[PDB]
């Protein structure tokens, strides 16, 4: 810290800790950002941060970070994805060294030779949102996979192994169970003294059809 | 490093690299922590880190980190969740600058002007556990989703696309197949010379009821 | 930066910011890396990271990082996994301090007293691949989980809650719905004037068997 004791007989120690603290400022790190656009190929995002540096004691902003490498949790493509849309919140993380042409050519080495640049940011899905703005319905006991902001449509999975595919129609396991329970309760319908091979149908045909069409209406994305 | 050559004719180089080196000390980074408590909203965790500093040559503690923003891998709520419980291990990461009132007010800026404070740690789910303590049953070939510590209940999914919902009762696809196969082997039971519409029941009704109750007992969380 | 004004009357400011600059180089940060081998216990990976720092004006290579703690997105074992194989891309992160025997012993402090060592890298799924190399089929509207590099065999899950287990055989909800629709369209087959309890069978028995065997062939991993 600057000037422990006074004006202009500034200790040599002060003016050295001053350069160390200045260079410690200069390093980038984590910070939140709002997505502006998502590239059609789905790996680079036009990220508007949420941090401004300190300039003229006042808010200025650095430019919108462009062609920021979006980073889903995938190993060789095999992994999980989240549909990124404009207005979402990501976390910007700088690189030790730029990786310009490790991305432009794959053969991995950047342009000149530095450290920790602002043009070195990657966007990650965990670490961005604010505590003020609340995400509703945070399941606390069971693994939850969310397909909507409210987490009211997706997959729920229990320590015992219980499952829930809570889609639009309802609990898919339950609806299939309803179908098969009507089978295990079903009673064929007889029409006449007709012993030749004609016109027998299950008494509960309509509900079976209804559930059968429901499973496709909740199944064909 | 301090004192490359000796006592008190310490080179101006030594007493400058020592300052840069202490300021390099002072920065925080990634380190494991144990969850102490989890807020009801499910976003802030009381974390006791597992990194301790060095002080008076001796183990001392900096306090249990409080209202550490828990950060699941969600984007707009749409993502994956893990049920955080008191005793699990997270990885704590500091931020370049603090977000006091970026979390207290959403409008994004903290109090005075620092870098890299210990009060800037976010907790992430990956990066905390120790290699001594072994996580059993690490599926190596198929993408595995777990709902238990032993990884014996959940969703297993193969490169070919094979699926397994290994719940309490067993492979749900197998149990649904054990239902469909009994229908495809089914043989209706005829009662009397009764050609009016009465008392026809599927011969394998009891087992279809059994599988039907199984699918709800493994489906209604 | 070095020498703002010239040869050998180098300002005291220059030869101090140069020390700060060098010590700012020395710190490690992220970098992409290639998996070489994966330990049988499934938590440590032999990694050949794709970065060389600058040596003798030229590529030299810092050696294959060993017993690098692999870090899946789990807490207590409960979480998601990706099958790590030799040749995939991870991102590395060093810590503020090494954790030698917080992994050798789980009691939590490494050997001497440092900061920020090369020997302290955790490997993480997200952040490693190059933008040149394209990961195909990035589902951009629905939560997608993959079991193959092409993202063509896995599970898709929509904001409305629609589901798709696109396995080798096809949409599992579609195939189960095909089964239920043929039951709800089925019409028992009569054999003779046989009113005693014999030989009645489903009219569409063969297709019901086909679907029933399909679900096991897509279900038993």
XYZ file of C-alpha atoms in Angstrom:
663
model
C 0.000 0.000 0.000
C 1.120 3.549 -0.879
C 2.353 6.155 1.586
C 2.306 4.599 5.051
C 4.061 7.581 6.571
C 4.208 10.601 4.220
C 4.639 13.055 1.386
C 7.745 12.674 -0.694
C 10.352 10.931 1.445
C 8.611 7.834 0.132
C 10.541 4.785 1.290
C 12.199 2.695 -1.382
C 10.059 -0.119 0.050
C 6.857 1.791 -0.739
C 7.715 2.470 -4.390
C 8.536 -1.233 -4.877
C 5.427 -2.604 -3.234
C 3.662 -0.031 -5.439
C 4.927 -1.626 -8.646
C 4.180 -5.104 -7.279
C 0.603 -4.084 -6.433
C 0.215 -2.414 -9.826
C 1.275 -5.572 -11.664
C -1.008 -7.546 -9.359
C -3.877 -5.337 -10.473
C -2.939 -5.859 -14.110
C -3.683 -9.595 -13.976
C -7.113 -10.701 -15.114
C -9.090 -13.423 -13.437
C -12.604 -14.634 -12.957
C -15.589 -12.357 -13.483
C -19.205 -12.707 -14.637
C -20.525 -11.770 -18.052
C -23.775 -11.687 -20.019
C -23.915 -13.454 -23.388
C -24.738 -11.233 -26.362
C -24.690 -13.666 -29.292
C -24.013 -17.367 -29.838
C -22.161 -18.437 -32.973
C -23.983 -20.791 -35.320
C -21.270 -23.427 -34.850
C -22.031 -23.201 -31.139
C -18.554 -22.857 -29.631
C -17.852 -19.091 -29.600
C -19.952 -16.497 -27.790
C -19.986 -12.725 -28.076
C -19.649 -12.083 -24.352
C -20.548 -8.810 -22.801
C -18.836 -8.968 -19.373
C -20.319 -7.528 -16.193
C -17.092 -6.036 -14.823
C -15.676 -2.612 -15.689
C -12.076 -1.748 -14.813
C -11.538 1.378 -12.753
C -10.927 4.316 -15.106
C -11.113 8.038 -14.323
C -12.565 7.121 -10.945
C -15.657 6.221 -12.921
C -17.378 3.545 -14.966
C -15.913 2.982 -18.385
C -16.204 -0.388 -20.132
C -13.737 -2.556 -22.013
C -15.061 -3.611 -25.437
C -17.389 -6.556 -25.901
C -15.260 -9.695 -25.826
C -15.563 -11.335 -29.241
C -15.093 -14.927 -30.423
C -14.735 -16.083 -26.826
C -14.261 -19.883 -26.831
C -17.394 -21.348 -25.251
C -16.521 -24.436 -23.206
C -19.126 -27.114 -22.588
C -18.258 -30.045 -20.300
C -17.405 -32.505 -23.071
C -14.497 -34.932 -23.536
C -14.194 -35.632 -27.242
C -17.780 -34.524 -27.783
C -19.048 -37.047 -25.240
C -20.591 -35.058 -22.396
C -23.423 -32.707 -21.402
C -24.719 -29.537 -23.055
C -26.760 -26.501 -22.029
C -28.604 -24.435 -24.699
C -26.863 -21.058 -24.629
C -29.001 -18.075 -25.578
C -28.512 -14.303 -25.624
C -28.891 -12.829 -22.126
C -27.540 -15.801 -20.170
C -24.754 -15.439 -17.604
C -21.335 -17.071 -18.056
C -17.991 -16.825 -16.262
C -14.943 -15.391 -18.012
C -11.602 -16.954 -17.188
C -8.287 -15.723 -18.621
C -5.542 -17.924 -19.989
C -1.926 -17.935 -18.863
C -0.970 -17.141 -22.465
C -3.095 -16.270 -25.454
C -4.180 -19.154 -27.626
C -5.036 -17.169 -30.756
C -3.559 -19.531 -33.263
C -3.913 -22.658 -31.184
C -7.523 -21.969 -32.179
C -6.794 -20.627 -35.678
C -4.510 -23.560 -36.656
C -4.745 -26.146 -33.865
C -0.966 -26.375 -33.870
C -0.773 -24.771 -30.497
C 1.142 -21.534 -30.121
C 0.001 -17.900 -29.819
C 1.442 -14.758 -31.499
C 4.121 -12.640 -29.523
C 5.200 -13.547 -25.897
C 3.246 -12.334 -22.732
C 1.084 -13.462 -19.816
C -2.580 -13.248 -18.750
C -4.301 -11.126 -21.414
C -7.900 -9.912 -21.544
C -8.107 -11.380 -25.064
C -7.582 -14.789 -23.406
C -10.986 -15.339 -21.841
C -12.977 -18.556 -21.955
C -16.685 -18.655 -21.109
C -17.814 -21.321 -18.637
C -21.324 -22.136 -17.488
C -20.703 -22.225 -13.703
C -19.837 -19.082 -11.747
C -21.685 -16.265 -13.470
C -25.108 -15.487 -12.013
C -25.778 -13.139 -9.098
C -27.063 -14.066 -5.645
C -29.748 -11.368 -5.802
C -31.406 -12.984 -8.829
C -32.785 -16.301 -7.638
C -33.118 -19.557 -9.582
C -36.323 -21.203 -8.277
C -36.837 -24.793 -7.168
C -33.329 -25.935 -6.252
C -33.706 -29.647 -5.527
C -31.620 -30.442 -2.471
C -31.880 -34.204 -1.909
C -32.142 -35.763 -5.383
C -29.968 -35.308 -8.459
C -31.864 -32.943 -10.744
C -31.425 -32.326 -14.474
C -33.262 -29.213 -15.595
C -34.705 -28.444 -19.026
C -36.326 -25.110 -18.129
C -35.406 -22.060 -16.080
C -37.881 -23.090 -13.375
C -36.472 -26.622 -13.229
C -40.061 -27.864 -13.460
C -39.461 -29.997 -16.587
C -36.656 -32.533 -16.669
C -35.224 -35.556 -14.872
C -35.113 -36.319 -11.149
C -33.084 -39.145 -9.669
C -33.010 -40.440 -6.089
C -30.411 -42.073 -3.806
C -32.511 -45.245 -3.860
C -32.679 -45.000 -7.670
C -36.210 -43.651 -8.129
C -36.704 -41.823 -11.418
C -38.957 -39.035 -12.652
C -39.209 -37.805 -16.260
C -41.428 -34.863 -15.405
C -42.436 -33.840 -18.923
C -45.448 -31.800 -20.035
C -47.956 -34.623 -19.602
C -46.597 -35.850 -16.278
C -44.439 -38.574 -14.780
C -43.634 -40.777 -17.781
C -43.018 -43.797 -15.559
C -46.466 -43.186 -14.063
C -48.190 -42.829 -17.438
C -46.610 -46.039 -18.735
C -47.623 -47.617 -15.417
C -51.184 -46.418 -15.989
C -51.188 -48.076 -19.411
C -49.913 -51.420 -18.122
C -52.200 -51.343 -15.078
C -55.143 -51.090 -17.459
C -53.716 -54.179 -19.183
C -53.352 -56.020 -15.871
C -56.962 -54.962 -15.217
C -58.169 -55.446 -18.789
C -61.060 -57.690 -19.764
C -61.624 -58.668 -23.384
C -65.010 -57.923 -24.955
C -67.048 -60.706 -26.586
C -69.423 -59.804 -29.412
C -71.536 -62.835 -30.379
C -71.437 -66.623 -30.493
C -68.633 -66.028 -32.989
C -65.920 -68.684 -32.744
C -64.186 -68.049 -36.092
C -61.622 -65.321 -35.350
C -63.434 -61.982 -35.546
C -64.065 -58.696 -33.745
C -62.657 -59.165 -30.217
C -61.171 -56.019 -28.680
C -59.940 -55.029 -25.234
C -62.615 -53.290 -23.182
C -60.242 -50.441 -22.251
C -59.039 -49.751 -25.807
C -59.629 -45.988 -25.669
C -57.518 -45.229 -22.589
C -54.756 -47.471 -23.927
C -54.781 -45.459 -27.160
C -54.826 -42.187 -25.221
C -51.750 -43.116 -23.180
C -50.033 -44.508 -26.285
C -50.489 -41.204 -28.127
C -49.440 -39.248 -25.035
C -46.098 -41.038 -24.951
C -45.390 -40.008 -28.556
C -46.566 -36.439 -27.958
C -44.098 -36.287 -25.056
C -41.468 -38.258 -26.970
C -41.036 -36.846 -30.479
C -38.988 -33.672 -29.991
C 14.539 -16.411 -3.347
C 16.052 -14.591 -0.337
C 19.772 -14.071 0.170
C 21.580 -15.604 -2.795
C 24.943 -14.623 -1.334
C 24.675 -13.580 2.353
C 24.103 -11.759 5.628
C 23.486 -8.065 5.289
C 25.101 -6.923 2.040
C 21.812 -8.084 0.564
C 21.735 -7.238 -3.130
C 19.162 -4.734 -4.308
C 18.009 -7.603 -6.541
C 17.252 -9.843 -3.554
C 15.194 -7.258 -1.645
C 13.168 -6.602 -4.815
C 12.464 -10.161 -5.876
C 11.558 -10.775 -2.221
C 8.835 -8.119 -2.440
C 7.497 -9.450 -5.747
C 7.684 -12.912 -4.181
C 5.689 -11.938 -1.096
C 3.062 -10.315 -3.304
C 3.007 -13.537 -5.313
C 2.387 -15.343 -2.026
C -0.512 -13.074 -1.143
C -2.702 -14.179 -4.069
C -5.325 -16.858 -3.491
C -6.130 -19.753 -5.785
C -7.753 -23.135 -6.102
C -7.918 -25.292 -2.980
C -10.249 -27.915 -1.494
C -12.891 -27.220 1.112
C -15.446 -29.099 3.200
C -19.094 -28.012 3.194
C -20.333 -26.969 6.633
C -23.909 -25.894 5.856
C -26.127 -25.246 2.832
C -28.577 -22.353 2.741
C -32.261 -23.067 2.189
C -32.224 -21.217 -1.144
C -29.472 -23.658 -2.109
C -26.925 -21.197 -3.500
C -24.631 -20.229 -0.592
C -22.559 -22.714 1.388
C -20.749 -22.367 4.683
C -17.324 -23.652 3.657
C -14.430 -24.583 5.871
C -11.504 -24.612 3.421
C -8.935 -27.374 3.699
C -6.056 -25.128 2.819
C -4.656 -23.501 5.931
C -2.039 -20.723 5.601
C 1.441 -20.743 7.048
C 1.614 -18.754 10.283
C 3.969 -18.547 13.253
C 5.541 -21.606 11.719
C 2.414 -23.383 12.829
C -1.064 -24.529 11.812
C -3.524 -21.709 12.506
C -6.886 -21.115 10.796
C -8.550 -18.411 8.817
C -12.257 -18.512 9.553
C -14.998 -20.621 8.048
C -15.784 -18.854 4.778
C -19.340 -17.516 4.888
C -22.021 -16.955 2.235
C -19.707 -18.442 -0.372
C -21.721 -18.360 -3.626
C -22.395 -21.973 -4.576
C -22.296 -22.270 -8.365
C -23.887 -25.261 -10.068
C -23.336 -25.945 -13.775
C -26.545 -24.163 -14.756
C -27.162 -21.540 -17.447
C -30.397 -19.706 -16.761
C -31.422 -22.500 -14.409
C -31.302 -24.924 -17.331
C -28.555 -27.388 -16.421
C -27.457 -30.182 -14.068
C -27.576 -30.252 -10.265
C -25.902 -32.204 -7.469
C -27.473 -32.432 -3.967
C -25.009 -30.596 -1.727
C -24.915 -31.884 1.838
C -22.860 -30.941 4.905
C -19.611 -32.915 4.549
C -18.935 -33.018 0.801
C -15.860 -31.477 -0.814
C -15.850 -28.438 -3.110
C -13.076 -26.470 -4.794
C -12.843 -22.800 -3.851
C -11.748 -20.257 -6.430
C -11.113 -16.563 -5.719
C -12.089 -13.833 -8.133
C -9.925 -11.073 -9.553
C -12.030 -8.561 -7.596
C -14.904 -8.868 -5.175
C -18.605 -8.884 -5.916
C -19.990 -7.637 -2.615
C -22.822 -5.667 -4.124
C -22.779 -7.431 -7.454
C -24.425 -10.080 -5.266
C -26.146 -7.767 -2.767
C -27.629 -5.566 -5.523
C -27.068 -7.318 -8.868
C -25.854 -4.028 -10.277
C -22.298 -5.096 -10.421
C -19.778 -3.556 -8.060
C -18.304 -4.268 -4.580
C -17.082 -1.790 -1.929
C -13.510 -0.135 -2.086
C -10.897 -1.136 -4.764
C -8.770 -4.394 -4.272
C -7.567 -7.426 -6.138
C -7.783 -11.152 -5.336
C -9.387 -11.281 -1.885
C -10.080 -14.378 0.203
C -13.633 -13.023 0.570
C -14.090 -13.635 -3.185
C -14.249 -17.411 -3.192
C -16.869 -19.307 -5.132
C -17.447 -23.016 -4.532
C -17.457 -25.402 -7.502
C -18.446 -29.045 -7.387
C -15.362 -30.452 -9.192
C -11.887 -30.174 -7.686
C -12.112 -30.809 -3.957
C -11.713 -34.463 -2.998
C -8.468 -36.208 -2.083
C -6.883 -39.056 -4.032
C -6.418 -41.041 -0.822
C -10.204 -41.204 -0.465
C -11.407 -43.323 -3.361
C -14.696 -42.805 -5.203
C -15.774 -46.369 -6.105
C -17.135 -47.732 -9.374
C -15.836 -45.212 -11.905
C -17.448 -46.237 -15.188
C -14.780 -45.799 -17.833
C -16.459 -46.652 -21.146
C -20.051 -45.393 -20.852
C -21.212 -41.943 -19.785
C -22.493 -42.462 -16.250
C -24.884 -40.307 -14.208
C -25.002 -41.122 -10.512
C -27.504 -40.511 -7.722
C -25.522 -42.291 -4.986
C -21.981 -42.170 -3.653
C -21.230 -45.731 -4.773
C -22.427 -45.005 -8.304
C -24.636 -48.097 -8.253
C -27.916 -46.264 -8.985
C -28.582 -43.969 -11.911
C -28.286 -43.661 -15.683
C -25.700 -45.470 -17.790
C -25.447 -44.620 -21.465
C -23.305 -46.245 -24.163
C -21.548 -45.116 -27.362
C -23.966 -47.324 -29.290
C -26.843 -45.671 -27.399
C -27.696 -48.478 -24.980
C -29.466 -47.255 -21.858
C -29.763 -48.404 -18.256
C -31.880 -46.860 -15.485
C -30.374 -48.933 -12.707
C -32.909 -48.057 -10.022
C -33.850 -50.017 -6.904
C -35.750 -52.794 -8.681
C -33.326 -53.118 -11.594
C -32.839 -52.194 -15.239
C -36.083 -50.359 -16.023
C -35.769 -51.283 -19.700
C -35.478 -54.928 -18.633
C -38.571 -54.653 -16.434
C -40.627 -52.976 -19.174
C -39.423 -55.759 -21.485
C -40.493 -58.308 -18.863
C -43.930 -56.727 -19.205
C -44.044 -56.596 -23.018
C -42.697 -60.149 -23.404
C -45.462 -61.594 -21.227
C -48.052 -59.842 -23.413
C -46.332 -61.102 -26.561
C -46.534 -64.531 -24.897
C -50.009 -63.861 -23.492
C -52.889 -66.278 -23.909
C -56.361 -65.128 -22.917
C -58.318 -67.349 -20.527
C -61.722 -68.589 -21.718
C -64.216 -69.334 -18.948
C -67.344 -71.047 -20.319
C -69.435 -71.253 -23.479
C -69.971 -67.563 -22.794
C -70.273 -65.513 -25.983
C -71.953 -62.396 -24.547
C -69.080 -60.213 -23.315
C -68.171 -61.459 -19.841
C -65.276 -62.577 -17.664
C -62.326 -62.696 -20.080
C -59.032 -62.029 -18.293
C -55.427 -62.233 -19.446
C -53.781 -65.428 -18.231
C -50.606 -63.664 -17.036
C -52.510 -60.915 -15.202
C -50.783 -61.380 -11.834
C -47.269 -60.738 -13.161
C -48.379 -57.764 -15.247
C -49.809 -56.298 -12.041
C -46.482 -57.028 -10.329
C -44.433 -55.209 -12.974
C -47.019 -52.421 -13.032
C -46.646 -51.773 -9.302
C -42.871 -52.019 -9.650
C -42.770 -49.267 -12.269
C -44.661 -46.850 -10.006
C -42.649 -47.773 -6.908
C -39.533 -46.969 -8.948
C -41.162 -43.930 -10.555
C -42.909 -41.779 -7.935
C -40.119 -39.952 -6.088
C 8.344 -3.525 -20.296
C 12.160 -3.430 -20.587
C 14.113 -0.312 -21.500
C 11.609 2.494 -22.006
C 14.424 4.886 -22.867
C 17.716 3.033 -23.527
C 21.034 1.240 -23.243
C 22.522 1.143 -19.789
C 21.230 4.173 -17.895
C 18.285 1.886 -17.248
C 15.878 3.583 -14.869
C 15.458 2.047 -11.455
C 11.794 1.829 -12.499
C 12.664 -0.379 -15.476
C 14.733 -2.916 -13.513
C 11.953 -3.215 -10.908
C 8.986 -3.552 -13.227
C 11.170 -6.103 -15.041
C 11.387 -8.193 -11.868
C 7.624 -7.870 -11.402
C 7.160 -8.862 -15.053
C 9.381 -11.930 -14.726
C 7.628 -13.091 -11.565
C 4.332 -12.540 -13.355
C 5.566 -14.828 -16.121
C 6.608 -17.498 -13.636
C 3.061 -18.178 -12.419
C 1.073 -20.976 -14.017
C -2.514 -20.769 -15.154
C -4.789 -22.680 -17.434
C -3.667 -24.463 -20.574
C -5.076 -27.179 -22.844
C -3.684 -30.686 -22.674
C -3.848 -34.116 -24.291
C -4.598 -37.219 -22.227
C -1.826 -39.802 -22.529
C -3.100 -42.503 -20.160
C -5.891 -42.961 -17.619
C -5.272 -44.701 -14.307
C -7.313 -47.803 -13.539
C -8.707 -46.200 -10.373
C -10.023 -43.469 -12.658
C -8.926 -40.289 -10.869
C -5.387 -39.607 -12.154
C -4.437 -39.008 -15.779
C -1.073 -38.908 -17.505
C -1.257 -35.642 -19.442
C 0.956 -34.197 -22.175
C -0.266 -30.601 -22.087
C -0.262 -28.781 -25.411
C 1.678 -25.763 -24.146
C 5.446 -25.295 -24.213
C 6.731 -22.174 -22.479
C 9.459 -20.297 -24.276
C 12.845 -22.091 -24.150
C 16.111 -21.159 -25.901
C 14.079 -18.991 -28.229
C 12.585 -22.258 -29.407
C 10.246 -25.136 -28.648
C 11.433 -27.267 -25.839
C 8.853 -29.388 -24.074
C 8.028 -29.548 -20.408
C 7.442 -33.182 -19.600
C 4.322 -35.301 -19.427
C 2.566 -34.328 -16.201
C 2.051 -37.406 -14.030
C -0.568 -38.430 -11.460
C -2.550 -35.334 -12.368
C -5.745 -35.527 -10.271
C -8.613 -36.005 -12.712
C -11.677 -34.079 -11.537
C -15.143 -35.235 -12.532
C -18.150 -33.072 -11.625
C -19.111 -35.086 -8.550
C -19.697 -34.350 -4.872
C -19.584 -37.450 -2.705
C -19.626 -39.598 -5.831
C -23.053 -38.232 -6.741
C -22.720 -36.493 -10.097
C -21.985 -36.831 -13.822
C -19.126 -38.697 -15.494
C -17.431 -38.711 -18.895
C -15.423 -41.740 -20.135
C -11.869 -40.402 -20.323
C -9.743 -42.082 -22.979
C -6.176 -41.602 -24.238
C -6.186 -38.711 -26.732
C -8.930 -36.408 -25.434
C -8.462 -32.754 -24.459
C -8.582 -31.472 -20.874
C -7.856 -28.062 -19.357
C -5.290 -27.831 -16.573
C -5.405 -25.568 -13.536
C -2.571 -25.117 -11.028
C -3.268 -24.285 -7.420
C -2.004 -21.539 -5.183
C -0.033 -24.220 -3.304
C 0.812 -27.866 -3.888
C -1.169 -30.619 -2.269
C 1.314 -33.522 -2.447
C 0.195 -35.283 0.652
C -3.319 -34.021 0.795
C -3.439 -36.698 -1.903
C -0.794 -39.056 -0.493
C -2.378 -38.887 2.991
C -5.663 -36.945 2.890
C -4.321 -35.076 5.861
C -3.811 -31.906 4.124
C -0.403 -30.322 3.596
C 2.317 -30.808 0.937
C 6.090 -30.766 1.522
C 8.114 -27.401 1.780
C 6.371 -23.938 1.443
C 5.612 -22.513 -2.155
C 3.124 -20.771 -4.318
C 1.698 -21.768 -7.722
C 3.664 -24.822 -8.860
C 3.627 -26.645 -12.186
C 3.296 -29.841 -10.149
C -0.174 -28.801 -8.896
C -2.418 -29.175 -11.916
C -5.945 -30.515 -11.806
C -7.362 -31.774 -15.106
C -10.896 -30.658 -15.984
C -13.246 -31.621 -18.797
C -14.213 -28.150 -20.067
C -11.627 -25.810 -21.563
C -9.235 -27.992 -23.512
C -10.231 -28.385 -27.157
C -9.234 -26.144 -30.062
C -11.751 -24.056 -31.997
C -10.240 -25.265 -35.272
C -11.336 -28.825 -34.485
C -15.121 -28.760 -34.635
C -17.384 -30.794 -32.353
C -20.406 -31.631 -34.558
C -24.125 -31.374 -33.860
C -24.265 -28.816 -31.054
C -27.909 -28.941 -29.984
C -28.727 -25.282 -29.477
C -32.275 -25.329 -28.053
C -32.625 -28.487 -25.931
C -30.598 -29.863 -23.018
C -28.516 -32.538 -24.733
C -26.455 -35.306 -23.111
C -24.216 -37.409 -25.320
C -22.584 -40.828 -25.317
C -20.741 -40.431 -28.636
C -18.499 -37.792 -30.171
C -21.084 -36.952 -32.838
C -23.811 -36.226 -30.292
C -26.126 -38.621 -32.107
C -26.634 -41.255 -29.376
C -27.785 -39.978 -26.004
C -30.741 -38.142 -24.471
C -32.365 -34.872 -25.543
C -34.670 -32.956 -23.222
C -36.786 -29.951 -24.239
C -38.082 -26.834 -22.440
C -41.622 -28.171 -22.794
C -40.363 -31.417 -21.232
C -40.243 -33.552 -24.380
C -37.827 -36.472 -24.145
C -35.763 -38.523 -26.579
C -33.503 -41.494 -25.777
C -32.011 -41.664 -29.254
C -30.314 -45.052 -29.003
C -29.184 -47.366 -31.800
C -32.738 -48.551 -32.427
C -34.452 -45.157 -32.317
C -36.553 -42.923 -30.081
C -37.321 -45.226 -27.147
C -40.541 -43.352 -26.400
C -41.517 -43.919 -30.042
C -40.799 -47.650 -29.829
C -42.706 -48.121 -26.563
C -45.533 -46.094 -28.127
C -45.451 -48.410 -31.142
C -45.940 -51.301 -28.726
C -48.845 -49.646 -26.920
C -50.521 -48.588 -30.173
C -50.466 -52.152 -31.511
C -51.999 -53.372 -28.240
C -54.654 -50.657 -28.442
C -55.266 -51.721 -32.062
C -55.014 -55.451 -31.351
C -57.893 -57.866 -31.861
C -57.691 -61.283 -30.214
C -57.669 -64.306 -32.529
C -60.280 -67.048 -32.055
C -59.309 -70.605 -32.959
C -62.426 -72.822 -32.943
C -65.722 -73.210 -31.109
C -63.413 -73.658 -28.135
C -64.944 -72.189 -24.980
C -62.797 -74.041 -22.420
C -59.707 -71.863 -21.945
C -57.277 -72.776 -24.718
C -55.076 -71.443 -27.510
C -56.184 -67.778 -27.581
C -53.298 -65.533 -28.652
C -52.639 -61.926 -29.641
C -53.244 -61.249 -33.328
C -50.174 -58.986 -33.640
C -48.017 -61.200 -31.412
C -44.946 -61.137 -33.672
C -44.524 -57.346 -33.709
C -45.121 -57.149 -29.963
C -42.314 -59.682 -29.520
C -40.110 -57.712 -31.912
C -40.509 -54.479 -29.938
C -40.085 -56.332 -26.637
C -36.770 -57.814 -27.778
C -35.700 -54.448 -29.199
C -36.077 -52.762 -25.820
C -33.792 -55.333 -24.195
C -31.282 -55.101 -27.041
C -31.195 -51.327 -26.508
C -31.331 -51.681 -22.723
C -28.917 -54.345 -21.455
C -25.549 -52.571 -21.529
